[PDB]
Structure formats: structure tokens, C-alpha cells
């Protein structure tokens, strides 16, 4: 499984670009495909979507009508033409893959990314922006929610992002309370479906990193990091 | 020395009826004279699981309860989503010809065969998102007809060849092999404990097997036709079994005899699919005619009919935690009655 | 003096023979492929629309028996809604005699390679556009007349998509399909076939020719009450035989009438 | 999220009426014989432990599914429930083998199979020109086996091949009348048997088992049609 | 040879067979019927569940 970012560089605002992303290593039509962009010394946002087989598409409210995805299941490749830019663009811009069904686990992969660079909302607030703590210890990131995300079904859309200084996030849990395939039973997820809790029982040195909260029921929490 | 042996045979026969006669001092009948028959019961089908093309042989739930694995003729896998009724997955096989589908207790994989003389394990949690067989297990000389996960890496499988094996799926090597049966082996049943499991043939008879030590313990003979399904009791220590002759029948595996018969006059066709409710009490049997019956275990009488197929019904199966009743049929819909 | 006397003895036979024949098979047909309506074959569904039409135009055929239009007549909108919801079922009636004879041309002599036209899916989509094309053939022209103002011209179109058309194209396909059979038999049961095919075209010609010709020649031309009352009656009559010919004359709905009197 | 579980399975309804539309267009053959019989060479004459072997062959743009059964038990009771409602089932026989009896006893429980009632069978004699050559040299003559052909003589039907003697005619036409009798013994109808004189080398088999295939849909249409 | 030794693997499987012990069958059919008594409440097919509770409906 590899997904690795096309394009990228130095644009003026009023320019275009494009931005693609070859799939390798996995069944490219059978995912629908994320791009969230990390602004430079800021968190994750989410900028759009295209669904299996080319059909639903939704973009962010900042970029609806300004970008435009595109897929090609043959070339297992993922545009985002950028027909206007802006200094808020400057970004790297993630491909994330996800799979929608019973059990599946959405956004498991995060593309390199490509640093672009430019000369209601269910809003997610994370309770802490950085944790000092010492390796070996017990840290209970926790977050909250401007609804409930519990619905109706009976699961909890949260997700729980590591992010690894100089690496791409990783997902962690999904749903609130599974762990993702090569997660370590270090962590462990909690909630009362609006107020949610990653309550990692040991530090390690690799846990170490910004750990970003995101509802699916786009949005990401503003982070907390952690500080060995 | 044939002949010897044979009357030797025979004696040991009439020896074993005997302890079995004897031991019959009442019936499941009067014991059950007491208990007040369950009365009317009534299901009504609250999913229609269509989509696929052809005859429906086989379905499987999962544990979870929700997800359940359906084969067709037409060389298709499907999970569905039985609440929602969305197809989670749909595994084309390289065999048209599928007589029989698990659904591994683990939920991670489905094991899949028949008249290809191979059991297919297929991987639903790879990290590609697609659906691609894990192992082909190759041993057999005739068709599939059951196949049930011990864990998941356990498979035992049945057998047109008059053979169960049980397999190891890493090596994909037979661990054993259960010899015995004078006919074909067209169903299994593991016991909750999945220590022991029971098989019934074309022979018409069901024999009692223990898979860590690879040998038959006992031996059953109620039917007069070759036993199409069998079933273990919830509690382990007794299974239903389906014969052509149109009869179910309950055994005991320690009083090793039959405890009761389920069958009627007008019901004259042959059983197809037999299994347990959640405490035992029903015994929901499918049959030739088109239609299900549901018979109360601990009587001899039916409880309700689960009509509303158009065509065989060919499997059966109630959820672990035993909501609902999924009937697969010839005419390729599922229906979940509950 | 003996007109009338005509008439009568006409429409008596017409209410003691075909009338009963008419309507109960109707009924019966629908309650037959409705109660097995999971088990339908794409034959069914026209099989189940051409009894509705027939059903409804022998109702409208009692009203012609004894001739109690009169009734309905003194009121403007019922004598409207009367005369076009005839015309509609008559017009459903002709177009799914056509479109059935044309499916079973391509059922029978296509039978290899036109799987994917005959769809049950498409079957009913066929049934919807040939409801629809009767009413458009139905209002259409009333409308037209209605907003430029018995007219010559729609007289001229009722009778061109009444018998003309359909009849030639009922004549096309299975003249077809007698050649797919003959060729077939004499190859490597298919008398019983031929014989039902002929039946099916013969009623529909002796049937809808009257009353066609009879209008037609007034389109160059009461003075004719026995006649018109006599080619109505062939008209009805034509509904009333097609649930005999079509349906419980061959085997497979008799046998499937079997299993619901079994059953139910 | 759940709508996006309801397109997936929207995709793969999609993909099963794709594969729908192939499953229709294709007619599926069983081929049955016994090993003596050059029913092995007749699938090897198409120009297009395992249980089933498949083999596909087109004629006229129509695709021919013909599946031969290998590895299976000597009892044919139990699996022959799954090739219920084939197009049709090709029955092969060695005309000149006795096991013919043998043969006569197994397209006997063919035909009076509870499922196969209404399949139809193309009986297919094969290896007509041994046949041939058994009945001239006077090594081996049916009437040892059999007694009627004692008493036998050629219908009038009985079309001569040119080249073929009397003898030859007569003694593949009883052949013939010994199947065609136990088919139209229980023939109600719903199933017809369409007896053929072939040999290993004749190409014209695939043209055969496309005329009778012909026959057979035309005659299930009839009978859907309520023509029958 | 093949012949016998198959009826002496048969004649041990009935030897095995008739050696095990066996209960009477009124005490199995007293254990299967406590089996039915204990959980006859947990089986909703048993006793129909409303429509607020079973997933279905």
C-alpha cells in the first residue's frame, strides 16, 4: 500500500495547479479517496472527497467551486486541479485512503503529501494543546464535540490521528473504541458520545507526537502534542 | 475368518442395542408431557436478501450476528449486512459449482467449496480492500459439502468420498482424517466446545467424532434414508438430524439413541437444513416443499411454518444470538424471519 | 319489425355465451397471477395488463347488451368519461395483442441471443408505454377535435391503429413464428402450438373486422342500428374470447389454475 | 458512515447485473458417460483431484458452458441435484462397446432422476464407425447381449447414410430405438431426448448441441408462452 | 487379507462403541429439558420480542 503525492512547489495566488496522487499496492477503485491538506505550524484540515466508482464528491466549504477532484481508476491515479490559490492554500496535502462498509476502517493510510506553497461545521475542540510527560506514563488525550456523535445506528464516529514528527498521521482508532490493524494495545479508546478520551496506557518513544481528533458523522481537532 | 469376524460384528451389534434398550426406560415424549407446548409460533420475514443470480446452496452467519455469508450456483460469495441488507462484499469464485460456505468465528475469513473437490479460504481483512483467497485446501477425491472453522486456522471439512478431514490452513495439510462413513458425508456440526463434532452420510447414518484424538465414538442409526442436516443441541449433548425420509430425529450422545422423531403424515418430503433456536426449544427444519417447518424440540408437534419461499429452501440458520432465522432457497433470495 | 327482434336474440346470446366467458376468466387470470404473482413470467405480466383491458371492456359491453347507453347519455361529462375510457381499453386491448405477438416472435424464433431485451424489468416498462401510447391515442386526437371544434380524419386514425396496423403487424409475427414452428417440428407437440396461433389470429380478425369495415365504409358513406349493434358485439366479443384463447387453452395457466384452486 | 456503505453496495448490485447479463446469455451443458465412452475426445474436439472441468465453446455468437465431471464418487445421486435446471445434459455412449446395459441402466436413472425431470438429454452415440466395424467383421454381434435384435427389422424412418450397409443401419437404428423407448417411457413432455449418430473425429457436434439447445429453448419459451 | 483386516478395523470400532458407558435416557431427557427451562427467557424466537428491541424491526 503506497500512495505517493504529484505536484507541489512555489505558485502565485492567482495561479493554478494540480496535485496528483498514484496509487500502488491495493484495489485503487474500490476506495474512496480523501486529500486533507496540514497548513504549515497548524492542524489538519479536510479539503475533499470522491467516493468508489467516481460518484458522491463533497469539498469544503473554503474550496467548493475553487478545486475539483478527479479519479482514474486505469492509471490508479487522484487529481485536485486547483483553478484559483490563495495564501491560505500553502499546505502539504495529504491522500488519504478510506472504505465505507460494516466494520471497514476509514482513513487506515495517509499519503507522503506534496507541500503546496503560494506567494453547520461539527466543530472539535481538544482539551489540551500540549502534554508534558515522561516515557512510560499513562496521558488521557481528550477532546469534546458540538454534537453528539453517537448516532442513531449506535457507534460513535470518532477518530484518533498520530502524527510522528516529519511523518504523515496514522490512524490509530476508529469509531472511538477499535483499534487500527498494526496499532498497539497501548491505546485505548473511550467516550460518552460527546465527550471522547485516548487514554494510552504506556509512552513509548515512537508514541511521541501530535494527536489529532476527527468526526466523520469534515472535521479535525486543533491537536495536542506530546512533549517526552 | 470373514465370517467370524462378521458374527463377532454382530454380537458387538446386538450388544450395543441392548445397552441402548436398556437404558431406554422413558421417552423425551413423557418427560416433556409436563412442560406446556410452546403453542403457536409465528415469524414473519423481515429481510428479503436478493441479488443473487442463481440457486442459493448454502449461508452462514457470523458471530457477530449481523453479517452473514451466502453461496449461489453461479459462482458468487456475497456478505451481506443483514440489518441494513447492503452487500458488504461479493467474492466471485473460480468454481461456478459451491455446495457449501463458512463464515470463520473471528469474522476474518469464509471458507468456501464444492463440487471442485476444494475448500477456497478466502481473506475479507487484507490491507488491499479486496477480497483474495488465503488457501485452497486439495486433499479430497469427491465434492464439498460441509466445511466449519474451528478457529481460524482449524477447518474440518465433509466429503462425497465418505471422508472428514480437518485441516491446518497455514500448511494447508490435512492435521486428520475421519474414515468411517459407508457414504457421503453431506453435513457436519461442531459442538459448542468444538471438542467433538458429528457428521451425518448417504449411509444414513450420523457418527460422533473427536478431533484431537481423530476417531469415531459412537455411532447413530434412527434414519432409513441418507441424512441431509444435522445439528448439535445448544447445550452439546444431544443434534437433530434431516433425513430424505422426511423425518427429523434427536439423539442423546449419552444415551446414545435416538430421544424423539419430528415428522407428520402430510409431511411427506424430504429435509434439506436443520438447526436449534437460542435454548434448544425449537427445531426449525427446512424441506423440500418450498416451505419451513418449526417444530417444538422438547414435543413431537409443529409450532408454525415459515412459508413464503418459491423454491427449495436449501439452507437454514439461526444467529448465535438468536434473534433471527436467515432461509436461503433455490429461488437465490435469503429471507430473515423473526 | 324483425329488427329489433334480431337485436335482441343477438344480445342474449352475446350475455349467455361469451359475456360469462368474458369476465370470469378475466377475474380468474388476475386472481391466478396475483396470488402466484412471485412466480410470473414475463408472459404473465401482458397476460395480467390484456385481461385488465378485457375485464373493463367487458363491463363496458354489458352497458352495449340490451343497449342501455341511454342511461348515461342524458349527462354530458359521464357520456365523455364513458366513450373515452372505452376507447383507452380498447386501444390497450389491440396494442398488447400486437406487442404480445411481437414478443413471442422474439421469445420463439429469437430465442438465442435476445436475452437481454426480454427482462421482466423491461416487461413492465413495455406494459407502462403501451398503457400510455392507448391513452395518448385516445386523448390526442378527442383533444385536438375538441380545440378545433365523429370526425372524419380520427375515424380514419382510430381505424388505421384499431385494425389495420395491429392486425398487419399480428399477421407479420406470427406468420413468423408458424414458420420457426413448422421448420422446428419437422425437425429432430408444436401441432397444438400452431393451432392455438391460428386461433389467436383468427378470433382477433373475425372479431375486430366488423366494426372496423362497418366504419370505415360510413367514412366514404342511423340506417344501421342492427349492424352497429352487431359489430359492437364483435367488438366485446373479441375481449370476451381472448382470456379463453390466451390463457386456459394452454397448459401452463391451467396447470397454474390448478395449483391455486389446490392451494386456495 | 453508512451512506457511503449503502453506495458500495449500489457498486456491486451494479457488477452483479453486469455479471447477470453474462449468467442469461450463457447456455450450461452437463456432459455425462462412462469412461469407455469418447465423451473425454468430444470435449477435446471442440475448438472452443479436481471434480469439474469446465470447457467453453461458442457457435453462432452463443457461448456454451459444458461442464464434464471428473473426480467424483461412483454414486451419482447426490450431486447431480446441483445441475438441476442446465439447459441440457449430454449423455454419451460407445454404440459399439457389453457394458451397454450398463449404459441403458444409467441413462434409465438420468432420465428418471426426481430433478433432472425436466432436462432434456442429447443422447449422443457415439463411436458409430467401430460400430460399424463390430457389426461387418462378425466378431461380436448385439443379439448375444440382446434378444430382439433377433427379431428386429428397420423402421421405415431410418434414413441411410450413403456407404452404409443394411446391417450397419439396423443395428445402430436398434441402439437408437433402446433409448428413444426408455425416454419415451416417462417422456411427459417437459423433457425430450434427441438421440444422435456421432463419431470421435465429427466436427459437427458443436453444430448439434447447438440445433438441440435451439430446440430446447424454443420448446421452454413455448411452454412459458402458454403455447404448450 | 484387505477384506479381513477392514472387518477387524470394524469389529475394534464396535468393540469401542459398546465398551463406552451410557445414561439412562429419562436423565437425558431431564437435562435437555432444565436446558430449555434455563434459557427459555434469552430466546427471542422462543418469546416473541417487540418491535423496539430486536434489530430487525
Known sequence: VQLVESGGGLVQPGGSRKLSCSASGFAFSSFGMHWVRQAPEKGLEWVAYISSGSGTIYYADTVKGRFTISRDDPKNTLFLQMTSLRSEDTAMYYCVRSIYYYGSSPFDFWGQGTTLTVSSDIVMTQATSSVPVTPGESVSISCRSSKSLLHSNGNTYLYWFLQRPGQSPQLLIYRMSNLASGVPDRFSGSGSGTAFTLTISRLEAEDVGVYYCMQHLLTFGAGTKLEL | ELDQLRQEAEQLKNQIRDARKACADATLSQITNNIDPVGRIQMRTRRTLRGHLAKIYAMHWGTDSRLLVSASQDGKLIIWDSYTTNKVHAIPLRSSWVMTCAYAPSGNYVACGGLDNICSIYNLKTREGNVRVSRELAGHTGYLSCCRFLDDNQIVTSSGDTTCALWDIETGQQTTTFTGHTGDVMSLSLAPDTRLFVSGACDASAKLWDVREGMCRQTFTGHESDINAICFFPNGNAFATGSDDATCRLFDLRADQELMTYSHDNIICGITSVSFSKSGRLLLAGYDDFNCNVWDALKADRAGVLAGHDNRVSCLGVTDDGMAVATGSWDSFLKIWN | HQQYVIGLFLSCLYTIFLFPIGFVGNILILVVNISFREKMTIPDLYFINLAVADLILVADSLIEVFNLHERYYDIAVLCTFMSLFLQVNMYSSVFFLTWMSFDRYIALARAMRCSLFRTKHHARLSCGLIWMASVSATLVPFTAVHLQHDVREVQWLEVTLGFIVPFAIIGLCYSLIVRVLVRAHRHRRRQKALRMILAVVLVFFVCWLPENVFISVHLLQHAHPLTGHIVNLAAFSNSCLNPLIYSFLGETFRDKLRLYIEQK | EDKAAVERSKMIEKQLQKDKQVYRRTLRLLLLGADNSGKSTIVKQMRITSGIFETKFQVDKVNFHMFDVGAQRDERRKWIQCFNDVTAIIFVVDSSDNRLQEALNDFDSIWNNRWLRTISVILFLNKQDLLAEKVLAGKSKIEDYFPEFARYTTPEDATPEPGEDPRVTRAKYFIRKEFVDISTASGDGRHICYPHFTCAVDTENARRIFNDCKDIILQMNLREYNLV | ?57
Open chain 5, 1 to 57: 487379507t484387505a477384506s479381513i483386516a477392514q472387518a477387524r478395523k470394524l469389529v475394534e470400532q464396535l468393540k469401542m462403541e459398546a465398551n463406552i458407558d451410557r445414561i439412562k435416557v429419562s436423565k437425558a431427557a431431564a437435562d435437555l429439558m432444565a436446558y430449555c427451562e434455563a434459557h427459555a427467557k434469552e430466546d427471542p424466537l422462543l418469546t416473541p420480542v417487540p418491535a423496539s428491541e430486536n434489530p430487525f424491526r
